Amino acid sequence: RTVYAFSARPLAGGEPFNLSSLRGKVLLIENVASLXGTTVRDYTQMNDLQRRLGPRGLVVLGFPCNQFGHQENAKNEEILNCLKYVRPGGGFEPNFMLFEKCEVNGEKAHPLFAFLREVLPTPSDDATALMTDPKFITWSPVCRNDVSWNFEKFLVGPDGVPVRRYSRRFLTIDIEPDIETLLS
Amino acid sequence: RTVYAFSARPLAGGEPFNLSSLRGKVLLIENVASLXGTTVRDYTQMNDLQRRLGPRGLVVLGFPCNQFGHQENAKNEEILNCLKYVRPGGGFEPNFMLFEKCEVNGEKAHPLFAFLREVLPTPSDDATALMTDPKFITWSPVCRNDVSWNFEKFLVGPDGVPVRRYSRRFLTIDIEPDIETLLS
Amino acid sequence: RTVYAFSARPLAGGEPFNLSSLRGKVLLIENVASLXGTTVRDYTQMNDLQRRLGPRGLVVLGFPCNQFGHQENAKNEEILNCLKYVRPGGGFEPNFMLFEKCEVNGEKAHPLFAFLREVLPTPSDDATALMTDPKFITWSPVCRNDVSWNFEKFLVGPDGVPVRRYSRRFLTIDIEPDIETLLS
Amino acid sequence: RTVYAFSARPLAGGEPFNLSSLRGKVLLIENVASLXGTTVRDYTQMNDLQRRLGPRGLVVLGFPCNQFGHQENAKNEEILNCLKYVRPGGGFEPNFMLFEKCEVNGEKAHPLFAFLREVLPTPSDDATALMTDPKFITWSPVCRNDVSWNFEKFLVGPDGVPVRRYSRRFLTIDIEPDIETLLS
Numbered sequence: 001r002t003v004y005a006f007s008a009r010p011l012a013g014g015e016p017f018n019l020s021s022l023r024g025k026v027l028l029i030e031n032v033a034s035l036x037g038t039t040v041r042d043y044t045q046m047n048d049l050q051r052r053l054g055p056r057g058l059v060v061l062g063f064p065c066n067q068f069g070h071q072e073n074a075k076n077e078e079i080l081n082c083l084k085y086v087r088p089g090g091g092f093e094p095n096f097m098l099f100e101k102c103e104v105n106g107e108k109a110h111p112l113f114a115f116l117r118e119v120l121p122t123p124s125d126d127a128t129a130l131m132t133d134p135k136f137i138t139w140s141p142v143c144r145n146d147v148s149w150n151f152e153k154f155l156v157g158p159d160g161v162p163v164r165r166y167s168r169r170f171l172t173i174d175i176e177p178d179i180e181t182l183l184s
Numbered sequence: 185r186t187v188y189a190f191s192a193r194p195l196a197g198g199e200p201f202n203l204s205s206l207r208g209k210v211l212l213i214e215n216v217a218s219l220x221g222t223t224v225r226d227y228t229q230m231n232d233l234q235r236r237l238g239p240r241g242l243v244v245l246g247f248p249c250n251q252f253g254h255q256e257n258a259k260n261e262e263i264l265n266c267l268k269y270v271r272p273g274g275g276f277e278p279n280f281m282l283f284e285k286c287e288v289n290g291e292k293a294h295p296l297f298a299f300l301r302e303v304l305p306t307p308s309d310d311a312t313a314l315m316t317d318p319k320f321i322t323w324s325p326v327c328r329n330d331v332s333w334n335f336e337k338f339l340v341g342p343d344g345v346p347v348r349r350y351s352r353r354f355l356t357i358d359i360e361p362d363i364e365t366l367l368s
Numbered sequence: 369r370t371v372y373a374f375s376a377r378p379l380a381g382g383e384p385f386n387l388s389s390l391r392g393k394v395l396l397i398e399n400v401a402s403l404x405g406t407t408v409r410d411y412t413q414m415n416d417l418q419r420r421l422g423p424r425g426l427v428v429l430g431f432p433c434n435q436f437g438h439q440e441n442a443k444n445e446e447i448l449n450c451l452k453y454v455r456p457g458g459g460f461e462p463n464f465m466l467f468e469k470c471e472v473n474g475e476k477a478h479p480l481f482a483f484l485r486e487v488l489p490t491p492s493d494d495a496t497a498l499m500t501d502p503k504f505i506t507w508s509p510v511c512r513n514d515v516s517w518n519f520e521k522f523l524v525g526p527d528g529v530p531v532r533r534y535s536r537r538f539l540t541i542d543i544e545p546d547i548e549t550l551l552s
Numbered sequence: 553r554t555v556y557a558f559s560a561r562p563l564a565g566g567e568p569f570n571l572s573s574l575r576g577k578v579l580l581i582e583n584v585a586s587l588x589g590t591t592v593r594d595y596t597q598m599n600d601l602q603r604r605l606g607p608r609g610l611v612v613l614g615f616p617c618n619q620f621g622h623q624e625n626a627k628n629e630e631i632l633n634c635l636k637y638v639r640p641g642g643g644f645e646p647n648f649m650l651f652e653k654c655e656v657n658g659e660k661a662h663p664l665f666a667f668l669r670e671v672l673p674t675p676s677d678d679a680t681a682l683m684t685d686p687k688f689i690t691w692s693p694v695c696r697n698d699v700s701w702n703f704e705k706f707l708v709g710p711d712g713v714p715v716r717r718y719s720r721r722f723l724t725i726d727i728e729p730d731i732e733t734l735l736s
Contacts, residue, residue, distance in 0.1 A: 035257035035258055069254055069257070070253055070254040070255070070257070071254070071257055073219035073253075073254070073255055073257070074219060074270060074271065078270050078271060078273070081269050081270045081273065082266075082270050084269070085265050085268070085269035085270065086258060086262045086265045086266055086269070086270060087258070087262060089262070089265065135322050138319055140508065140509065141508065141509030403625035403626055437622055437625070438621055438622040438623070438625070439622070439625055441587035441621075441622070441623055441625070442587060442638060442639065446638050446639060446641070449637050449638045449641065450634075450638050452637070453633050453636070453637035453638065454626060454630045454633045454634055454637070454638060455626070455630060457630070457633065503690050506687055
């Protein structure tokens, strides 16, 4: 089983992009939010990765999600303006694909994220922490493989097959060595 | 007891503003958030009241709060950027005072808000509703007089004594007759 | 993995019976209720099986459960009187072990039932029906392997290992041929 | 309009009993269930009122209903068996009339109950509560005057006109002063 079964709508406006278009690419999927504490670090790093490694086969995929401290409250139409004007601000524009706002955990989760969580049930660098304060767990049902926060990272190989999952605490730029490995 | 006992720091950068300055003014106090469903409507109608009734003694005061579905996630520094370029966007600017972000409910509430809730314990148009879904109550302790949501309104007389409180659902513009009655 | 890991409290009064006592026996576990439509049929049949096949190695285990149309509403102390005086009535007494009232589905389910449902995820005779009227699904979370109603049947071999699951519609007496097979 | 327009079948075996017989009587009508938390308390205090105030013109009428957490799952034939040997048990017998099991809410409600709820639309001691958990509302349609739970009480005057309605929480014995007032 691969990611190629799935599709998502581009942020910019509907007309469903099928992940089977990206066959033979190395994918770096993140769930993103515009008003997180690691917003700037991960968006800056994802643009850097995309710019440098894109021509060698890397594609970075961003999926906005409001589940985690509601850090993506805006509408689909307002998300680019947050990024640009508020945070990271300064004229920022993602150089990579963003999709419509969807859920990653719970009964309404996007089937791409239900898959990624099934095939890679814990992050490689932090097998056990789920959430420190329960009050943030607002979706149902709650599963052992759930995404913990904004900016979890999932690395998919050139054959569609999910390779590793990194926590909210793992830096986007430190995924580079594993990416090079799949690129080679 | 009046509001003139209290002070707040302005959004832009503190130097604590005493509310005792506003003697002789009619005050319209709201707790605000940039990413709410009634953001465009309340901010528009506050701007409108401030412009039209300002010259005759109305002062509108806006207090950013992240307690209600976390609809003010940005820092004090990014808030005007939210309003101008995201929502309402289009170059929107508040024509009235905004103070730093603070809590209105629970043990760390700003003392102005602990005050207001003490002397006007339920909103004049909805005495009973507190919250439909308990998942949003994340503050402690929970008191019967607590503020339900973004954009509750408090009307204060020109002697600094709180007159009336209005719920999350009461239109800002519909308080205009009550302001008239005090303004007169 | 076997049933021997588990224990339950006897209906009659606490002092936890460990299923590892029954090692080398063939177990027929049912979830039971006293005011079901198949109450009489399954209780009569379970006593017959127990009486006839008990001396050859069969043990019938009954677990009262209120999850299904709340058909076991009484307290643990009142269950024997229902059976005896109401339904099946007539002086009826189960000849086999009953345990305290517990849940079979949802987050509070007895770990024995979470296991049985995991290792045998659908009934052998009805792979797909869960519930006809959703209004009866009152537990959370809802899982694909859930027990549908009162009187599901689980057959465990002489080595602890769960062998087959029969639906609410399968007669207790028609499990006899499979039982003989494990007994031999 | 009075109760004398209506009839019901007795628990034991129908021959429809006209309520117009009870002219000159004060009536205490309850919707009952054998397996509720207030079963022992209401049935005791109904027995008590019937015995003591019967000779002076009180008639207590009990209507079995399975609409509220299904606390009357038995058939009309087993109900007295429930009361006598399970709960309250100990040989308990109602000293007053019981009618067959019927619904009190929704499109198939008994007409006596559709009547009662029409002319006494909220319980005199709790006008607002309907149900804390919506999972228990399984009837259709749902009306503002619906009966909340097992053991609501209706007091009817000796002219067959309904006087007052009391909630699930109002003690049966505490209606004694109101019965006195009508009895006089």
